[PDB]
Nucleic acid binder design. Structure first.
Ligand code: MG
Ligand code: ZN
Ligand code: ZN
Lengths: 463, 142, 61, 76, 581, 303
DNA sequence: GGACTCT
DNA sequence: AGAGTCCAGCCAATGACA
RNA sequence: UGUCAUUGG
């Protein structure tokens, strides 16, 4: 209720995509999942998050964030992240994939470098993108489905069922550290991807020698009116000053989803926490500790910046949209059988569809040869195709002679013209012929033209 | 599943063939859901029943119950809901796994299936409609 | 499995992990010797995940 | 929309001379059937008809025809 | 023929339909069964109303027909797709390519008299991946064989730097989405674009993906190098404003760089960086940011309201000066003076100097800039809870004068208009209070970063600060408040037939105080209504966009400066000037 | 306390403190245990959690007596953990590890001494003890830069060579070829206030180890100052250069920046500055560096 | 659900 | 005046299922 | 080879 509505809709959409402690049977269930590695319970919570045990099955980590501009790299929701933070297991996840192949028993008992003498993949082996998980050879001509991911994955579990058909279920695992392009968010729908992995020696630091794990830009916090993120950082820092109650027990800070306590009560709570920690402070230092403002120093010149920076800890979430899950490239590959253009899928190694709006953009650029070479079939797939000028269909080569069968049955002998069109064009024309529409093409026998010299023309004005 | 209703009736409704299903018993599977997920089985309860068809003619003080066909019993496999702590409603004695909340069904291919709630089509208030102007419709259901 | 260092600053927090989780002291008596707020949040918020035992063998035919 | 004697919408081709492949690319399922009924013979000058036959469109650099003068090569 | 019905392989429909035709082709057979077989082979919707039958009409049925899917659009080789990220070592004329793309994608080197030594050298060092023999017309993948290199053949090697890739973002709404710039080798698995092109492609770095295609045909290479280069596309083709420029942080960096004063020569040269090589200190020892801007522009041009002999005679440099697609862009004036190369050089050099200003001085907005204490927000809370009770008592006095009968009642439209005017007056009072607070804060604390990015012209105005610190206003659905349901009310938190304007959707609280339950209902009603409306309108806008594009796409400028389509003259002079727009 | 956080604060010249801080962060590299091999894992954690946590063991508390030979890369180290579930003390501390030093002069792998305060640490807590099923973990982690070949596998007499060769061939494609390292402690210097944020342990003297680190740093910094030369003539913008025809120094180095900022210039990275290069006295900068290192050791002696 | 056409 | 007919953005990614 | 479910810009 302290942010705007669309940010709450986006936050409810992104909370279900945050990586958590997904299952207790992480090493047992052969199933797809992403698991958080060094989980931390949230502390600035509601009671409904405690009683549903979502807080116990932790969905993020507490990191140190700075709300500043880091050399203009933080622009358009890009975040700066620390390399030493990532190396120490910071927001580290594990992706577990399930592979299931169904082999004939004669194919199983009959690219295989990771297979053992059992015909199955070796435990704790890392599968590369051309590796088969079990032996499948059909009469040689092996037809085994192969590993097709961009990254390697360690074989965690193999479960084999012998029946009329061999069923092999392999659970593989991979530790994914934050790389460039990995999506992250807060509990306030402040999301973005990794723009730069900075070393800890090129990051700004405070008087205590603490560099932030994440640098978020500060303009998007106040343009999107996400006011509760600042209160969450203030309350997280006030917990880190005093994490216990007067009995000594770990108590969380109740900041509900729809909060009715004022900000001044939270400021008074933070003041009491910071006054319990250090029993006397100057009131400038106390107001800098409550509002989480800090003087940060340029790591290159060891000089402070102009103004104080919003600097503090927050519960930060990793999202399930990784760069290597979306990364696609194709040089050459399979073609579909009917139209003889590239195939579709990412597991199949297909092409990116140059759609119709991209065709509009290349028409609007004035690049006619570019859009011609894009939309036509490849130069490697060229063959001499002849068409009949009378009836319109493709000529045939009987034993070396280009003939038209329809016109040689009709006692004609018409012209045959070589055409360079796409295969889908010929399939479309043949299917329209099958519907009954005869399509007949006419060709330009242009009169031979001659270049003649022209007079001098000067378009400069006369003053 | 407990049914006792007349199927057909002849000769001025004094002869009738009644179906009769009884002895309905539901038993849980003999494993945990994690063994069903690993091995490949499906976490299904097994229900069995005895179904009897017989013709029943009423005399003045006699009831001629002549057994036509009978069938005593596994009959139906029902998907079993994994509950809180991997505890189904049928296993009355089982150790609570201290983290699982359940609420899913294990498929025949070890696939976890989860369900949403759905708004009914039958309305508890009647429905008003304007077909054409000065023509109205009031549709209700029972 | 716990991280032995703080993931923000890199300071050793192993002894406080033993003093908090195994000896079962309070957070006050453990965090009397921890000064950075990141390490205090690591010692106050990090848990080990509740996990069941691994079903063996890992290769089952 | 007012290039003919009457305002014409963006959904149909009523007065403007559009080819059969232009109407079929625009979306008209009976375009080639109506062209076959009326025995239409249309020149290939539009983008939708140039992309069908793998021709360079008459847009931009493709607006002009390009020749080569083999006189200076044959002279030496 | 079988070419329209090949053998389907996965582990034909038309062949089965022809078999059901030939199963009735007998002498003792009716014409009705043969007619039905012919019809359901050709077009099932003549006699039925079912779809998903693969008949002949399936190639001309709707959006997924053959021409729209496989002729004007296709899936291509030499393509890639990846998440994007920003880069400061990449100008607007360049693009960063990840290592997996340039390790997979190949470029063509043709065999001729010029490149036969390079091709022989690359074949001797096993750097050649493919070889195409044009005379035998066959491609060979090189995994030693015999290859004779004739002119017309080509080889394909790994793609090198400064090769033009055609990359773009989807949806391609306009031609600045799909451009062709030079490949640079970068790190990671992300396609690193410059932020200066980001507003041209409607792109954020929050998970957007972009695609690449490599078209290594020599005519296409020349057209990519000239026509689709981002220097060629600098000015917008309708309103002439620059397509590239600065974004969020560089706006406030530009503002604060113009406002800076009394710098040393070393501080000026630190801000300038690698562009401090030809900086001339004339006889000065203390400099200002206006001298930095005079050096950055580098031309003695005049413009009414902006420039005079190169100096900026405007009071402040705001977002109209440096952001893309603005009417007061300095890069637009510098490219109106000489050429698009000068405007693109000003954009690159300006972005470098603004990011160096951000590196030296920094920019951050804290919570203390927004709400330093409780004084102003408590004052506006007391003002709002006084004035809305005044409104409620005036409306209740009118209602009781109607109810006892001393006056005749108004119409419901006029009554709603009167209450609408009173609540709009309260909203304008909140706006004026926020504006006076902004004035008093910038004369008390003149280095407030929130008011700095408000004065620079980026996304902060008195209305957003009223939403945070003042009031949230009246929530409108379909132009009016929320309509009354059952019992003459919206929520059961109000009495039946309640005349409370706060129960019809007027929110008194703000984001600092926090909305209550009913206020959160009306805010969520507006938010979910906007989400539903944009989801319902996206497909309709796409359909109309495709219709207009297909209608207008054949209209070009002819060789005499006239606008024609087909053989019809639309305009006698293109753009009324026979000059580019 | 077994571990106490302490701070060493030396007030210096600002550019000298920045030079010492950047030379520390560039030169003093303590290697990490990134080369990790799991030999048998029947515990409830996956191999990647084990290897990421064992990668950052604070090994300067154990291998302190060889700090200089570890800092000059003439000596590596090794940890080995074989630990199963138990009835009582059902957890893994750092005392359960076996710590070995690896003299690269001989490939000599010999066991170092283990402090008894490492029993008061925690890495893992096992689940509920069952003697029915096994819950054990075995792993070996080498320091970064160690080349694993048959010369060093011939010395691993405390484990199974077959299992190690098989699991190393399994994991070999994933280990980072780059030298992965750690700075020993936080070194900052805000406005010339050079600060070391150190951790002092009860079982060894921190002053001897700190003196070894500072002596290594002083030697490496003086060698880098002596082998530092600034290009003359014209300039392309990749290295720091000096144009005498304009009298302009192009700073694109950190050492050049700190050296000319010692002599009254206000430079930044990649910037041109009107600076006369006859003012740069290399011997005065080296003498200020030596006096600063003596001041640092004097400040650490009063810890 | 909604616009154009034939009836 | 009322039914038939065709139309409903682009580009993705996983998994299950026939 | 196509449907269904979920998700992204
Ligand atoms: Mg985006
Ligand atoms: Zn013919
Ligand atoms: Zn820490």
């Amino acid at each position: 209720n302290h942010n705007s509505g669309p940010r709450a809709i986006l936050g409810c959409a992104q909370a279900k995509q945050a990586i958590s402690c997904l299952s207790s049977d992480i090493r047992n269930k052969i199933d797809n999942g992403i698991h958080l590695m060094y989980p931390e319970r949230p502390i600035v919570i509601s009671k409904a998050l405690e009683t549903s045990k979502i807080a116990a099955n932790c969905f993020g980590q507490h990191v140190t964030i700075a709300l500043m501009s880091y050399k203009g790299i933080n622009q358009e929701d890009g975040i700066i992240i620390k390399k030493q933070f990532i190396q120490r297991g910071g927001l580290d996840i594990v992706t577990a994939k399930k592979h299931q192949v169904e082999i004939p028993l004669e194919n199983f008992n009959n690219a295989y470098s990771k297979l053992e003498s059992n015909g199955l993949v070796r435990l704790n082996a890392f599968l590369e993108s051309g590796d088969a998980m079990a032996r499948n050879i059909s009469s040689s001509f092996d037809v085994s489905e192969k590993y097709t991911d961009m990254y390697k994955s360690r074989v965690e579990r193999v479960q084999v069922e012998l029946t009329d058909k061999v069923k092999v279920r392999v659970l593989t695992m991979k530790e994914r550290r934050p790389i460039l392009g990995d999506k992250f968010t807060t509990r306030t729908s402040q999301k973005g991807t990794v723009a730069y992995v900075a070393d800890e020696t090129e990051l700004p630091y405070d008087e205590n020698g603490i560099t932030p794990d994440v640098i978020i830009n500060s303009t998007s916090i106040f343009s999107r009116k996400t006011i509760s993120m600042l209160i969450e950082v203030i309350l997280t820092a006030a917990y880190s000053a005093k994490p216990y109650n007067n009995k000594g027990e770990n108590r969380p800070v109740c900041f509900p989803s729809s909060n009715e306590t004022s900000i001044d009560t939270y400021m008074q709570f933070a003041k009491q926490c910071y006054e319990h920690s250090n029993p006397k402070l100057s009131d400038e230092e106390l107001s800098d500790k409550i509002f989480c403002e800090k003087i940060l120093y340029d790591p290159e010149t060891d000089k402070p910046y102009a103004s104080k920076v919003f600097f503090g800890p927050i519960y930060y979430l990793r999202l399930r949209h990784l760069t290597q899950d979306k990364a696609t490239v194709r040089c050459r590959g399979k073609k579909t059988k009917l139209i003889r253009q590239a195939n579709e899928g990412r597991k199949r190694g297909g092409g990116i569809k140059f759609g119709e709006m991209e065709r509009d953009c290349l028409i609007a650029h004035g690049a006619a040869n570019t859009i011609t070479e894009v939309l036509k079939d490849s130069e490697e797939d060229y063959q001499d195709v002849y068409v009949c000028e009378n009836c319109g269909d493709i000529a045939a080569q009987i034993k070396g002679i280009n003939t038209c069968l329809r016109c040689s049955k009709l006692n004609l002998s018409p012209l045959l013209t070589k055409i360079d069109t796409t295969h889908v064009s010929k399939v479309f024309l043949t299917q329209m012929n099958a519907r009954g529409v005869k399509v007949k093409l006419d060709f330009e026998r242009r009169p031979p033209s001659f270049y003649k010299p022209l007079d001098k023309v000067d378009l400069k004005p006369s003053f | 599943l407990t049914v006792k209703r007349p199927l057909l009736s002849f000769k001025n409704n004094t002869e009738r063939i009644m179906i009769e299903i009884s002895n309905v018993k539901v038993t849980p599977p003999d494993y945990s859901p994690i063994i069903a997920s690993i091995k490949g089985k499906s976490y299904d309860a097994l229900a069995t029943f005895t179904v009897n068809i017989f013709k029943e003619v009423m005399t003045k003080e006699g009831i001629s119950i002549t057994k036509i066909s009978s069938y005593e019993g596994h009959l139906i496999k029902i998907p079993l809901l994994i509950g809180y702590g991997n505890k189904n409603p049928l296993d009355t004695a089982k150790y609570l796994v201290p983290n699982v909340i359940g609420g899913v069904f294990i498929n025949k291919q070890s696939v976890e299936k989860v369900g949403i709630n759905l708004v009914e089509k039958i309305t508890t208030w009647p429905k008003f409609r304007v077909v054409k102007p000065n023509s109205f419709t009031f549709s209700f259901s029972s | 499995v716990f991280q032995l260092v703080c993931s923000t600053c890199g300071k050793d927090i192993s002894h406080e992990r033993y003093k908090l989780i195994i000896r079962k002291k309070s957070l006050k008596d453990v965090l009397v010797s921890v000064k950075n707020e990141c390490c205090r949040l690591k010692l106050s918020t990090q848990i080990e995940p509740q996990r069941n035992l691994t079903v063996q063998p890992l290769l089952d035919i | 929309l007012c290039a003919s004697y009457e305002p014409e919408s963006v959904n149909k081709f009523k007065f403007g001379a559009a080819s059969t492949l232009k109407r079929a690319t625009f979306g008209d399922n009976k375009a080639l059937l109506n062209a076959a009924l009326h025995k239409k013979s249309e020149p290939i000058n539009d983008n939708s008809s140039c992309h069908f036959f793998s021709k360079v469109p008459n847009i931009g650099t493709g607006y002009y025809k390009y020749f080569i003068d083999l006189g200076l090569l044959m002279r030496m | 023929p079988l070419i329209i019905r090949p053998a389907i392989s996965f582990w034909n429909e038309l062949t089965y339909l022809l078999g059901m035709i030939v199963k009735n082709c007998n002498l003792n057979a009716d014409e009705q069964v043969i007619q039905k077989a012919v019809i359901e082979y050709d077009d099932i919707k003549i006699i039925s109303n079912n779809t998903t039958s693969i008949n002949l009409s399936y190639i001309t049925s709707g959006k997924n027909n053959m021409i729209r899917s496989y002729i004007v659009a296709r899936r291509k080789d030499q393509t890639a797709r990846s998440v994007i990220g920003p880069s400061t070592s990449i100008t607007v004329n360049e693009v960063g390519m990840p290592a997996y793309i340039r390790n997979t994608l190949t470029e063509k080197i043709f065999v001729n008299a010029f490149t036969v030594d390079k091709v022989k050298q690359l074949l001797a060092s096993n750097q050649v991946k493919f070889y195409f023999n044009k005379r035998l017309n066959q491609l060979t993948r090189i995994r030693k064989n015999k290859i004779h290199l004739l002119p017309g053949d080509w080889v394909e090697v790994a793609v090198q730097e400064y090769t033009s890739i055609i990359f773009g973002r989807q949806p391609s709404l306009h031609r600045y989405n799909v451009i062709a710039s030079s490949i640079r080798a970068t790190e990671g698995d992300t396609i690193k674009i410059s932020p200066g092109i980001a507003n041209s492609q409607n792109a954020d770095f929050d998970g957007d993906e972009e695609w690449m295609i490599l078209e290594q045909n020599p005519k296409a290479v020349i057209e990519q190098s000239i026509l689709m280069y981002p220097t060629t596309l600098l000015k917008h083709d309708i309103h002439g404003a620059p397509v590239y420029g600065s974004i969020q942080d560089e706006i406030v960096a530009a503002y604060s760089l113009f406002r800076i004063q009394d710098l040393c020569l070393d501080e000026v040269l630190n801000i300038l960086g690698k562009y401090g090589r030809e900086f001339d200190p004339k006889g000065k020892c203390k400099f200002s940011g206006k001298d930095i801007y005079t050096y950055l522009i580098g031309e003695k041009i005049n413009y009414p309201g902006l420039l005079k002999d190169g100096e900026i005679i405007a009071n402040d440099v705001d977002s109209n000066f440096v952001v893309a697609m603005r009417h007061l862009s300095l890069a637009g004036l510098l490219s109106d003076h000489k050429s698009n190369v000068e405007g693109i050089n000003f954009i690159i050099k300006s972005s470098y100097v603004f990011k160096r200003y951000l590196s030296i001085y920094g920019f951050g907005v804290t919570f203390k800039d927004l709400r330093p204490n409780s004084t102003f927000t408590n004052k506006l809370e007391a003002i709002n809870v006084e004035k809305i009770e005044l409104i409620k008592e005036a409306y209740a006095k009118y209602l009781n004068d109607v109810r006892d009968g001393k006056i005749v009642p108004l119409s419901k439209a006029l009554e709603a208009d009167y209450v609408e005017s009173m609540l709009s007056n309260l909203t304008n009072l909140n706006i004026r209070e926020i504006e006076e607070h902004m004035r008093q804060t910038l004369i008390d604390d003149p280095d407030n970063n929130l008011l700095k990015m408000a004065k620079a012209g980026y996304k902060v105005n008195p209305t957003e600060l009223m939403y945070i610190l003042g009031t949230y206003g009246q929530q409108r659905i379909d132009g009016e408040p929320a309509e009354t349901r059952v019992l003459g009310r919206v929520l059961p938190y109000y009495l039946p037939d309640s005349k409370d304007p706060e129960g019809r959707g007027y929110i008194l609280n703000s984001l600092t105080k926090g909305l209550t339950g009913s206020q959160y209902y009306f805010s969520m009603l507006v938010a979910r209504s906007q989400s539903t409306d944009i989801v319902c309108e996206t497909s309709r806008t796409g359909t109309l966009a495709r219709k207009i594009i297909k209608k207008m796409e054949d209209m070009v400028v002819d060789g005499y400066g006239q606008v024609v389509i087909g053989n019809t003259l639309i305009k006698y002079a293109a753009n009324y000037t026979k000059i580019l727009g | 306390h077994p571990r106490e956080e302490n701070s060493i604060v030396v007030e210096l010249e600002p550019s000298l403190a920045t030079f010492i801080k950047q030379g520390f962060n560039n030169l003093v590299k303590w290697p990490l245990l990134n080369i990790g091999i799991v030999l048998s894992n029947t515990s409830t954690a996956v191999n990647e959690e084990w290897l990421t946590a064992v990668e950052h063991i604070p090994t300067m508390k154990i291998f302190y007596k060889h700090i200089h030979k570890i800092l000059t890369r003439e000596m590596g180290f090794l940890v080995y953990l074989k630990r199963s579930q138990s009835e009582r003390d059902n957890y893994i501390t750092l005392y359960d590890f076996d710590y070995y030093i690896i003299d690269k002069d001989t490939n000599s792998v010999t066991m170092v001494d283990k402090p008894t305060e490492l029993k008061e640490t925690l890495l893992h807590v096992f689940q509920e003890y069952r003697l029915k099923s096994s819950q054990t973990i075995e792993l070996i982690a080498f320091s970064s830069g160690t080349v694993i070949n048959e010369d060093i596998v011939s010395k691993l007499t405390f484990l199974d060579v077959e299992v190690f060769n098989r699991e190393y061939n399994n994991v070999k494609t994933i280990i980072d070829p780059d030298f992965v390292f750690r700075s020993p402690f936080i070194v900052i210097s805000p406005m010339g206030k050079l600060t070391f944020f150190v951790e002092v342990y009860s079982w060894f003297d921190f002053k001897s180890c700190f003196k070894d680190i500072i002596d290594f740093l002083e030697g490496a910094l003086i060698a880098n100052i002596h082998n530092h030369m600034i290009k003359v003539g014209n300039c392309d913008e990749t290295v720091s250069s000096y144009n005498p025809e304009s009298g302009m120094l192009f700073v694109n180095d950190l050492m050049t920046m700190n050296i000319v900022n010692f002599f009254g210039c206000n430079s930044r990275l990649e910037s041109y500055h009107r600076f006369d290069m006859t003012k740069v006295d290399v011997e005065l900068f080296i003498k200020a560096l030596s006096d600063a290192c003596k001041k640092i050791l004097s400040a650490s002696n009063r810890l």
